[PDB]
Scaffold this active site. Structure first.
Site, short mmCIF file in Angstrom:
data_model
loop_
_atom_site.label_atom_id
_atom_site.label_comp_id
_atom_site.label_asym_id
_atom_site.label_seq_id
_atom_site.Cartn_x
_atom_site.Cartn_y
_atom_site.Cartn_z
N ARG A 58 5.84 2.50 -37.68
CA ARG A 58 5.62 2.27 -36.24
C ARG A 58 4.25 2.12 -35.77
NH1 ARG A 58 5.34 6.02 -31.59
NH2 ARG A 58 5.91 5.11 -29.63
N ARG A 66 -1.43 5.78 -16.52
CA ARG A 66 -2.01 6.78 -17.09
C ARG A 66 -3.45 7.28 -16.41
NH1 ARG A 66 -1.11 8.25 -22.61
NH2 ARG A 66 0.46 6.71 -23.42
N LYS A 82 13.87 0.09 -25.59
CA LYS A 82 13.64 1.67 -25.42
C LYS A 82 14.25 2.14 -24.28
CE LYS A 82 9.45 3.14 -26.66
NZ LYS A 82 7.92 3.32 -26.76
O1 LIG Z 1 8.69 6.90 -27.55
C1 LIG Z 1 8.46 7.03 -26.45
O2 LIG Z 1 8.12 5.75 -25.82
C2 LIG Z 1 9.17 8.04 -25.55
O3 LIG Z 1 9.85 8.77 -26.14
O4 LIG Z 1 8.76 8.20 -24.40
MG LIG Z 2 7.86 6.46 -23.55
#
Ligand SMILES: O=C([O-])C(=O)[O-]
Ligand SMILES: [Mg+2]
Ligand SMILES: O=C([O-])C(=O)[O-]
Ligand SMILES: O=C([O-])C(=O)[O-]
Ligand SMILES: O=C([O-])C(=O)[O-]
Ligand SMILES: [Cl-]
Ligand SMILES: [Cl-]
Ligand SMILES: [K+]
Ligand SMILES: [K+]
Ligand SMILES: [Mg+2]
Ligand SMILES: [Mg+2]
Ligand SMILES: [Mg+2]
Lengths: 510, 428, 510, 428
Positions: free
Chosen positions: C60, C107, C253
């Site tokens: 990754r 951020r 995600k």
């Molecule tokens: O992997 C990610 O982006 C998380 O778990 O927030």
């Molecule tokens: Mg995340």
């Protein structure tokens, strides 16, 4: 071990059957009700006493034949025999009386008294001319359905005498010329079926009205209503019984295709169901009857309403002292299906071994009740099923399993809480203590309910409850259901005679 | 949406149960799983212990691997001062239990593990001293370290003597032999701790979850308390929120069937003891609503042995009834705790309000999931039936004040070893 | 006995757990994919070789940080390490490359280089004035969400650095005055969450577009798309990848409340799901994350689409050589939940023990795979599930159980028939033989698929099949999956490279 | 609506399965349960035997309790004349098996039952004679009367010798000791007859259904044929329609799991032999559609032992696939019958077309529910792959001509120890 307890613990139905043990003896208590049609072979007081001793719980009177005077005398004998045991309330068995209607029957006339063999391929004229209603023979056959010509056509099949003789319509005003398909000996006043015809006889005839009002006057506990096709048929019987008859249970007999197709609305309107397999198996193909039987028993079990398996269960026993192997199997499988009651017709009304037929249904039913796969049945009944009264009942059934209780004792006025327990099919017998004699008789419609009639006066609430519970304990000990040191479940209402049946005790037997 | 994950509770398979779990279905029922907190420098003050109780502490664990008898007696004294500061309202008062965790056969320089057939005694001469001291300090329960065999338990039992015969013995399983001999240890014990710190050094760490699930399952089947312990919220020793693995561990211990979950350094020495307690409380409540009772109760019901005990049959009948009518509580009058214990092993969704006049029974009831002990201090009435109903109304008042149920709701009341009478009644 | 075979035969889930045996060893084959985030601790060629040896199946690359030049070099090193084993095709392990997008992140800026402790109750001004974007400290905090003032109100909570620092808005034009709730040491470029705010950043930013097109050019196998909220977000990523990128798998995600609420439409549009627990557990209450995880894994298992459990699984291993007991439990339970893959982030990208973290996920996953209650999982997957290809796959899984086969060997071009087998979660490993290198890499998204890349030329149909099957046999024997005399299931298409995968053999291992 | 009781087949519980049984859902699949007909004066003519075959007879039973060797040899000859009258069309030809039912230890005046430890031999000197005669008459199977123990079976086996080693031995269970020792008898036998006539005199008649269901269940679990016999349609000896109890008995024997059902006096001496055969055919077909395969297959699958036999794993995989894709048939090439037997024990809904060149295999396949044997008479082709596909196309032609499936339907084809290859293919 007893009670098929080893098979009871199996984790699959297949292994359950693999574990069934002919050397595992059952408990004593027989849960399935036994309904016996009364007739010349069983209607004397002395024979009825032995019928009751042998297991009869309900006396069925078929109003397809006979007179009111004749049936009144039979009912009187049933009650004389039943009350001959009233001396000991611990052993007294309530006996219910059922009136089975004629309904929209079709029957032939009387054969000439001077029986007739019908020859395959031979011709037969059906007539409506009442001049021949008592002169039937191999050429002219009278029958009593006056409108028959309007509902049958050329090609139609006409079945006679338990569907055993079949005729085919070849010419059709007030007559029908037919050809004999399957012949046989033709007798008098035989039943006629017209499967697939839209028979237009009334659901409740003038005679039925008279018989139903007679049933009210005779204080019958239930009516078995023949040829129910739809909910409105049931409502008509309800109307005739009326408010004086409002507490008589209406059991709809399902015995034609429309009654099967409209079963749900019939069941909703009815107090219970008969699977009336004699007519049913002529009205629809005989090889489909078992589907209708299992459908109806399943849906009655799902609904918690009584269901009776009826007709030809021990047929050979009319002439023989032992049944065939298929008859033994049929009784066992009706119990395994879930039938609340099983029935005898000609086996007890007119055959040579009425007592042996009752005794055999008792023995088979008891063996089959032990063979029930309670683990799956209870799980499915629970999942497919709440108010407080239902929760207390299902809680009492689970407690009875947990301690393998000798009985579930239920104090009830109308029977309702006993019915609710029976719905979950406990292994243990349900001793229903009532002061209502009609409740005690009607309770036999429900699998596993052993009704006992308390005659003692009302006490002093907590003492009156304790009186009726101790009564049930004496009943159970005297009948061999349990012994001192066993455990029983006791169900009562919150107070007095509340329908809010919400109280359960787990009680060792002193 | 429906509260309490009832949409998922009604699923016909476990897979569909999972697919229906809903982050927007709020929990409603009180929190059932006991929370055991190790006391130490970060939590031993009276003021902190009051907040620990308010935050959800049910059991105070004192670890006799360190410290002095006098230091631990002062901690106990402060626990009881904080607990009794709520005693003025018995309707709201929460009993708090005291646990003594033995040193056992430790190798120290500081700890040394020889993953070896170590022949150090389970119960040393020191150990018998601390055990006799616990008897004098009136502790409710002993967590016995490094139990290897049933005779180890029998020693702790016999050592506690006649006067400590009522103290619960929880065997800690934390080496390979304790796992191998688990069945004889469980039979001899009053409950089990899955002591994962040492266990995960003594056996490969990747095997700990097997031992944990094995032990929780066997304790559930036996109806004896089981505690999941150690590192459940470890990062909160230094941080105000746990890691995602820590949140998952606490939830899965509850889903596994643990009666209690426990905090060690997180409350004894960490910087966020109160947050750790509050987080175990929040997760346990969410996980409890997620339990697939349809399967769990049926399996517990099926595997229950057939017996002649009227209390046992009443208990299973009562839990059955509690599911079918969605009762707000199961109210149980009990002297020894045994009848409430018998209800809890079948794992009702509804809370178990256990009414007792015995203070030790009330404290010890926190070992069992779902038991909410309430300590009745009214004098024993002259007529029994009146004394019974006094205690039942007490429970009725408790449940309404704590928000378990409200007037009109249906609850289940168990009275008399024999607790052999069930009434399904509306709350008055 | 091995493989938790004793627990496998239990008739209830409770007894299944009661039978789990720490002395029952697993098979060798580890089925759950292991995804490793690459960074400074793991990006040298030599370390990547050991990552692959230790169990890494997917590398990754997190595009939240870094430059294209930097990530291109990392990807080059991954491929150098991966192809260093290409000499022996029997032992070669395909390694996939995943691009994880930045997405709509918030951020903070850089702390003054002259780190900052925020004191509970102290005041903190958030500014959008870029003059302070590299001068953040205890009084002025810059962040990069230019529209923040419009979506937060007085009372709002602002979370910083993995939700560990919390701020409360007290005054709100281009600034926010806040109070420190939970303090801590504030570092540079920390993630910011605004739970409950309607953050209006784009699903696919200009930077994301650039990173996604870069992924196409770098031939990445899959995209992990951050902060997917709705199906149309997924479609936007699809559009950017476009037709050149049409075969790249899109893993959405799920890490905010809307993505959970809209999960079904997201799953329908996606090739798979990440349970992205880091942000998720800040966006929603941390005590609810396990509900969302089990929901999503269950619904992905039901749909047959890959699901990844991610984030903080072995968090302490960033600094320690052994995990905590909760971390060991978390990995095991994600496998027991049904996750196809498990992930490491800081544990492999920047921690001190990247190899030990990979090895520990390998060991735990293998133990947990043996502990799966296949009897219930297989029954529920079958009942909740046909065309010929599906029937052959479920038939192959049942056959593998019946003979406890050493492997299910599947010849596949795109992976589809291997995916279909994996959906029913066999115990035996699925050796998927492909000549498609991209199929071989992408297959790692699916539990139990061991992809093997056949380099031999096409033969001569029946000989070409036999070539690839014998290849799989050599693979299985060399890796310790099975031995001569064991039994394997073999799945092929009707002919050539047909999607009509309809042929199953049960084959002893020579 | 739906045909074949598929509405009920999809029910999630057995109770709901029953509630969905529909008298208006017509059966579609061919009839799976074998029909065994006792031949006698009412049915032994060639012309009658042709109609018996057309009506559904699969097995001709010759009862050696009466008659002479010469009388029975003439009956056999007429059976084979009637059977071979259809041999000109192999696509439609139905193999018909021949069964020899021994006299065994009878007490006659005429029969006497002593429900007693009778010490008459299972295999008398007469019995060995009739058994050796059956070997000479090329019978397919022996029904051995009054088997009490496994050594009784071993005797019949060893007596039949080397030349009769392929004849199937069906033990008749009809006394209490045979029930007690059933497990050792089953292990020694090729199948079982539930011989209810004698059984219901030797044990209480109310217990026969227990023994019947026990034996059918155990035979199903072992994958060995079981026959339900005697009085199933008894009233049709004199009447053209059965009683309701008789219709129910036949249906329930099929629901129980019987591979075959049987007729005795109903076909041997009664007035309506053809109607009796036709009624067993009609009921069996209706009952087969009513089977709750969802439970039956899962239980058979679960209880199947784990083995290394490739044919066994292929069979269970094939039946699994047959449910999931609603296949029109499972086509099995088999020399000995064994691989088709292995398919049938998992009870697919789809018919099993067993293609063989072995005539005895084709006849003996009628002992197993759902196996439709077809006898291929084409010469063995030179290339094996061509000879395989010749036999598969034969099966394809059979199924289309008999209405089992049609072009385009999906079927499952099992080929080769090993029958270890499954193809799920559209019918060409
Ligand atoms: O992997 C990610 O982006 C998380 O778990 O927030
Ligand atoms: Mg995340
Ligand atoms: O009326 C009846 O009883 C019947 O037909 O079965
Ligand atoms: O003693 C303990 O609690 C441990 O080792 O986990
Ligand atoms: O021999 C038989 O077939 C019997 O007794 O049933
Ligand atoms: Cl009592
Ligand atoms: Cl092969
Ligand atoms: K302390
Ligand atoms: K003959
Ligand atoms: Mg009738
Ligand atoms: Mg320890
Ligand atoms: Mg016999």
């Amino acid at each position: 071990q007893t009670q098929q307890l080893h098979a009871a613990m199996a984790d699959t139905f297949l292994e359950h059957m693999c574990r069934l043990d002919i050397d595992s003896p059952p408990i004593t208590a027989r849960n399935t009700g036994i309904i016996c049609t009364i007739g010349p072979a069983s209607r004397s007081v002395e024979t009825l006493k032995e019928m009751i001793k042998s297991g009869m719980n309900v006396a069925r009177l078929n109003f397809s034949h006979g007179t009111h005077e004749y049936h009144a005398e039979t009912i009187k004998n049933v009650r004389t025999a039943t009350e001959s045991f009233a001396s000991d309330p611990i052993l007294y068995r309530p006996v219910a009386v059922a009136l089975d209607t004629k309904g929209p029957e079709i029957r032939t006339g009387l054969i000439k008294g001077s029986e007739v063999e019908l020859k395959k391929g031979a011709t037969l004229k059906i007539t409506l001319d009442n001049a021949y209603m008592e002169k039937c023979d191999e050429n002219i056959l009278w029958l009593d359905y006056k409108n028959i010509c309007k509902v049958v056509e050329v090609g139609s099949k006409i079945y006679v005498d338990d569907g055993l003789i079949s005729l085919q319509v070849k010419q059709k005003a007030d007559f029908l010329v037919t050809e004999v398909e399957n012949g046989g000996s033709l007798g008098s006043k035989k039943g006629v079926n017209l499967p697939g015809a839209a028979v237009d006889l009334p659901a409740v005839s003038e005679k039925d009205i008279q018989d139903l009002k007679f049933g009210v006057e005779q204080d019958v506990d239930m009516v078995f209503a023949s040829f129910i096709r739809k909910a409105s048929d049931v409502h008509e019987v309800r109307k005739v019984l009326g408010e004086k008859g409002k507490n008589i249970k209406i059991i709809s007999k399902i015995e034609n295709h429309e009654g099967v197709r409209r079963f749900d609305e019939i069941l909703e309107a009815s107090d219970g169901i008969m699977v009336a397999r004699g007519d049913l198996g002529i009205e629809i193909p005989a090889e489909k009857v078992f589907l209708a039987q299992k459908m109806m028993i399943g849906r009655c079990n799902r609904a918690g309403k009584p269901v009776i398996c009826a007709t030809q269960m021990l047929e050979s026993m009319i002439k023989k002292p032992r049944p065939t192997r298929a008859e033994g199997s049929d009784v066992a499988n009706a119990v395994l299906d879930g039938a609340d009651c099983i029935m005898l017709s000609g086996e007890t009304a007119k055959g040579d071994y009425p007592l042996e037929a009752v005794r055999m249904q008792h023995l088979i039913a008891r063996e089959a009740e032990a063979a029930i796969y309670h683990l799956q049945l209870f799980e499915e009944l629970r999942r497919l099923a709440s108010d407080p009264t239902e929760a207390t009942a299902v809680g009492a059934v689970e407690a009875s399993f947990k301690c393998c209780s000798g009985a579930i004792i239920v104090l009830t006025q109308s029977g309702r809480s006993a019915h609710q327990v029976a719905r979950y099919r406990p292994r243990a017998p349900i001793i229903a203590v009532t002061r209502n004699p009609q409740t005690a008789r009607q309770a036999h419609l429900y699998r596993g309910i052993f009704p006992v009639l308390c005659k003692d006066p009302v006490q002093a609430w907590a003492e009156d409850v304790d009186l009726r519970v101790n009564f049930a304990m004496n009943v159970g000990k005297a009948r061999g259901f349990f012994k001192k040191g066993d455990v029983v479940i006791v169900l009562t209402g919150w107070r007095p005679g509340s329908g809010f049946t919400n109280t359960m005790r787990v009680v060792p037997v002193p």
